[PDB]
């Protein structure tokens, strides 16, 4: 739990591939820390598209933390267009999610000034 969060948060991909072996218990994959942020949230927050792709290939459900944000909210707040493009080719249903204040991902991408996002 603690190692996987670090490895995903800093893009250490081989550590993630090693930890995510013997795929049978998805309780470790979709479990958030104290702020309720799953590994997918962290990997997208720091903008590591390869880790996001690897986690999605195992299925990560797109949950929500203690502020209603999703992976796309973080990726847009940061401005990483590549991980956004990776996310937008899977379920295609998270584009219009809302946090605690009814903000979409577009709200954040525009507030922070990321034109390409």
């Amino acid at each position: 739990k603690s190692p996987l969060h670090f490895a995903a948060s800093y893009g250490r991909i081989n550590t993630c591939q090693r930890l995510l072996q013997d795929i049978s218990d998805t309780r470790l994959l979709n479990e958030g820390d104290l702020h309720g942020m799953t590994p997918l949230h962290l990997a997208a927050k720091n903008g590591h598209d390869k880790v996001v792709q690897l986690l999605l290939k195992k299925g990560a459900l797109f949950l929500s933390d203690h502020n209603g944000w999703t992976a796309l909210h973080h990726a847009s707040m940061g401005g990483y267009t590549q991980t956004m493009k990776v996310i937008l080719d899977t379920n295609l249903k998270c584009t219009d999610r809302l946090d605690e204040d009814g903000n979409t991902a577009l709200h954040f991408a525009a507030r922070e000034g990321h034109a390409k996002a």
């Binding site: 603690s2 190692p3 670090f6 800093y10 893009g11 250490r12 720091n46 590591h48």
Partner: protein, 33 residues
């Protein structure tokens, strides 16, 4: 000085990318959790 500041920003962003690469490639053994 505006031009100088823009060049400074560009260089700092390249440096930030390099540092993130360092963190994602380094060895961690004794200080693991």
């Amino acid at each position: 000085q505006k031009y100088r500041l823009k060049d400074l920003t560009f260089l700092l962003e390249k440096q930030h990318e390099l540092i993130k690469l360092i963190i994602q490639k380094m060895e961690i053994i004794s200080e693991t959790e």
